Design an enzyme around this catalytic site. Structure first.
Site, PDB file in Angstrom:
ATOM      1  N   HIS A  22     -43.288 -63.086  61.448  1.00  0.00           N
ATOM      2  CA  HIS A  22     -42.782 -61.719  61.262  1.00  0.00           C
ATOM      3  C   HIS A  22     -41.619 -61.738  60.288  1.00  0.00           C
ATOM      4  CE1 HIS A  22     -45.075 -61.643  65.053  1.00  0.00           C
ATOM      5  NE2 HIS A  22     -45.390 -60.405  64.688  1.00  0.00           N
ATOM      6  N   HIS A  29     -52.209 -59.461  61.422  1.00  0.00           N
ATOM      7  CA  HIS A  29     -52.601 -60.389  62.481  1.00  0.00           C
ATOM      8  C   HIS A  29     -52.956 -59.638  63.758  1.00  0.00           C
ATOM      9  CE1 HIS A  29     -48.212 -59.809  62.889  1.00  0.00           C
ATOM     10  NE2 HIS A  29     -48.439 -59.901  64.189  1.00  0.00           N
ATOM     11  N   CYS A  64     -45.939 -55.372  74.681  1.00  0.00           N
ATOM     12  CA  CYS A  64     -46.756 -55.772  73.550  1.00  0.00           C
ATOM     13  C   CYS A  64     -46.665 -57.287  73.406  1.00  0.00           C
ATOM     14  CB  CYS A  64     -46.335 -55.122  72.238  1.00  0.00           C
ATOM     15  SG  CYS A  64     -46.449 -53.321  72.264  1.00  0.00           S
ATOM     16  N   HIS A  66     -49.057 -60.945  71.509  1.00  0.00           N
ATOM     17  CA  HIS A  66     -49.909 -61.553  70.489  1.00  0.00           C
ATOM     18  C   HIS A  66     -50.932 -62.472  71.161  1.00  0.00           C
ATOM     19  CE1 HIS A  66     -46.290 -60.360  68.082  1.00  0.00           C
ATOM     20  NE2 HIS A  66     -47.193 -60.120  67.146  1.00  0.00           N
ATOM     21  N   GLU A  84     -42.652 -61.226  80.306  1.00  0.00           N
ATOM     22  CA  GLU A  84     -41.542 -60.343  79.920  1.00  0.00           C
ATOM     23  C   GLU A  84     -40.952 -59.613  81.117  1.00  0.00           C
ATOM     24  OE1 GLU A  84     -42.654 -57.781  76.773  1.00  0.00           O
ATOM     25  OE2 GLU A  84     -43.557 -59.357  75.543  1.00  0.00           O
ATOM     26  N   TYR A 101     -51.843 -50.845  62.665  1.00  0.00           N
ATOM     27  CA  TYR A 101     -50.724 -50.154  62.017  1.00  0.00           C
ATOM     28  C   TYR A 101     -49.879 -51.133  61.214  1.00  0.00           C
ATOM     29  CZ  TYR A 101     -47.327 -52.245  65.102  1.00  0.00           C
ATOM     30  OH  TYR A 101     -46.565 -53.166  65.789  1.00  0.00           O
ATOM     31  N   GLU A 111     -44.115 -55.157  61.025  1.00  0.00           N
ATOM     32  CA  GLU A 111     -45.247 -55.537  61.870  1.00  0.00           C
ATOM     33  C   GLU A 111     -46.495 -55.035  61.140  1.00  0.00           C
ATOM     34  OE1 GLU A 111     -45.051 -57.686  65.734  1.00  0.00           O
ATOM     35  OE2 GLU A 111     -46.281 -57.526  63.896  1.00  0.00           O
ATOM     36  N   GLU A 113     -50.528 -55.115  62.124  1.00  0.00           N
ATOM     37  CA  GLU A 113     -51.326 -55.592  63.231  1.00  0.00           C
ATOM     38  C   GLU A 113     -52.586 -54.782  63.467  1.00  0.00           C
ATOM     39  OE1 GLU A 113     -48.347 -55.484  66.289  1.00  0.00           O
ATOM     40  OE2 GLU A 113     -47.777 -57.618  66.026  1.00  0.00           O
ATOM     41  N   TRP A 158     -44.992 -47.586  66.652  1.00  0.00           N
ATOM     42  CA  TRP A 158     -46.317 -47.738  67.270  1.00  0.00           C
ATOM     43  C   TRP A 158     -46.433 -46.981  68.585  1.00  0.00           C
ATOM     44  CZ3 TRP A 158     -42.832 -51.756  67.067  1.00  0.00           C
ATOM     45  CH2 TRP A 158     -42.368 -52.241  68.295  1.00  0.00           C
TER      46      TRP A 158
HETATM   47 MG   LIG Z   1     -43.596 -58.405  73.649  1.00  0.00          MG
HETATM   48 MN   LIG Z   2     -46.888 -59.091  65.333  1.00  0.00          MN
END
Ligand SMILES: [Mg+2]
Ligand SMILES: [Mn+2]
Ligand SMILES: [Mg+2]
Ligand SMILES: [Mn+2]
Lengths: 176, 180
Positions: A22, A29, A64, A66, A84, A101, A111, A113, A158
């Site tokens: 990032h 990605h 959010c 990955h 988290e 986005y 970002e 993604e 987002w």
């Molecule tokens: Mg996160």
């Molecule tokens: Mn990302």
């Protein structure tokens, strides 16, 4: 951890270490976004820790992350919920499969993604990881939509885009 | 830079270095808050930089600051608008002279202030100062007020307290008129 690089057609072509991935020039990605509700139907809204590389200190939807290579989106959601928020959840459900986005945060971090969107219900108490989350609020989805519609700039870009897509808003409006 | 310490009754008793002043046990001191509108009547909302010691990264009204020795509250408004936003303003109007608040921030830093509130018009372009402001938006006041009503937790607590004061809110509304 890594992110999964995607070509035009969305095909995985390789990976990058997540932190290194990032930057002001983030390449496309894979990601996910999740919206979590408790058993009473309240929405969990979270504030990103000031240490996050992208959009630190920003209010946003619950979680959010990955997906890693060969990990299902549902498993990625489950994983980051635990990591988290120390929370157990119901099997994640699809609310906006084709969300994609690109955005730039106030410090210039981007970002970029493919970011399918899910919803789930928490089945345990949160146990906050303050390396990821600096604040959070349980609230009525209706009020959050009102705030997103009135002052979108006060939320992640987002979260605004997901909430203002007709079908997604329809489907989140039902977890309550 | 310092802050002006106040006692029980709102009377200055001395000064204290500014950084040192804001801690987990901040003493009562003088501050100001200002709401700025452009010619068109849009409100400037700002996002505190990540490096601010108190409420970093938080969305809030246009400019807040601390009068220094010998300075009037209005000149402090003028100064901070220039320092934080690069911007010239019309004479600040007093819209909530009795505002006072105490609050603990997400990391435990306390603000404890006598904080008269002003409004003014900008008369120049912005030149944002990135050591103080990380983001900003020109908005319709009504929109902001609806946002604060819906999700008050998304904004600084002092922004929300000032905006819901009936008298201050009426003055904010007067500043939404288009003024050439
Ligand atoms: Mg996160
Ligand atoms: Mn990302
Ligand atoms: Mg200030
Ligand atoms: Mn202060």
């Amino acid at each position: 951890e890594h992110v999964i690089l995607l070509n035009a057609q969305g095909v995985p072509t390789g990976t990058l270490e997540k932190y290194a991935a990032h930057t002001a020039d983030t390449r496309l990605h894979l990601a996910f976004s999740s919206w979590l509700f408790n058993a009473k139907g309240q929405l969990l809204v979270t504030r990103r820790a000031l240490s996050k590389k992208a959009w630190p200190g920003v209010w946003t939807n619950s979680v959010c992350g990955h997906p890693q290579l060969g990990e299902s989106n549902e498993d990625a959601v489950i994983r980051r919920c635990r990591y988290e928020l120390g929370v157990e959840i119901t099997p994640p459900e699809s609310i906006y499969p084709d969300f994609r986005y690109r955005a730039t945060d106030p410090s210039g971090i981007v970002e970029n993604e493919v970011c399918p969107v899910f919803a789930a219900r928490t089945t345990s108490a949160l146990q906050i990881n303050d390396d990821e989350v600096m604040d959070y609020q349980w609230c009525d989805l209706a009020d959050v939509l009102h705030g997103i519609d009135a002052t979108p700039w006060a939320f992640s870009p987002w979260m605004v885009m997901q909430a203002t897509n007709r079908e997604a808003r329809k489907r989140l409006s039902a977890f309550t």
